Amino acid sequence: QVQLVESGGGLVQPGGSLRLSCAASGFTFSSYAMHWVRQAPGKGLEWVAVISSDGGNKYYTDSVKGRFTISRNDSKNTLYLQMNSLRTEDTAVFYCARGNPPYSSGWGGGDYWGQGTMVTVSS
């Protein structure tokens, strides 16, 4: 069965860098698109990034452009999120969600999510 697991979240100081990892299993990882979404304490859901299957395309929300870098390893079946210059406004729980399958709208999917890791940037 499809299963996703995030890890690497933790306590960091304002300004440091941190890398998130999302381990996938139970499906053909190489043929799906992957997303990262977050949720600030007491707030709602906010999409952050997406990478196409072959890592060929990447898109980010204005708020993290230049600071975050999404990537994947279709060999280890892992999705990553490299975060640099962490501001206190990034404190949140990050989730990885399955994107779209081949031959369908690049914005499709959103059916499977991980349990999430929380990054709390404070000193």
């Binding site: 709602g44 989730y95 709208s105 914005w107 959103g110």
Partner: protein, 106 residues
Amino acid sequence: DIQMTQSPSSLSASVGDRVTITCRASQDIRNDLGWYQQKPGKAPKKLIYAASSLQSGVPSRFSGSGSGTDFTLTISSLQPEDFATYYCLQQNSNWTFGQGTKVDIK
């Protein structure tokens, strides 16, 4: 990046009541919308997608309707386990959500 606006933001109800949550878009997003439910401390679970399609394993008391810019999530008979916050997701272009609707005990 469409502006998804959800309402009400919260509402008190009791078991049995017929609850109704609605979401409207700032521009036509066709039928590319999905509803999610999130209980405290866990990740969101998809209930509906493509505006009306039920997600496998979801009770029929959940139904959704709408297209264009006016959508609606309807619950027939509110159950003891249906208390949580509900979110609508815009999947026509860059992912955008609604502020959220939390339904809590009367």
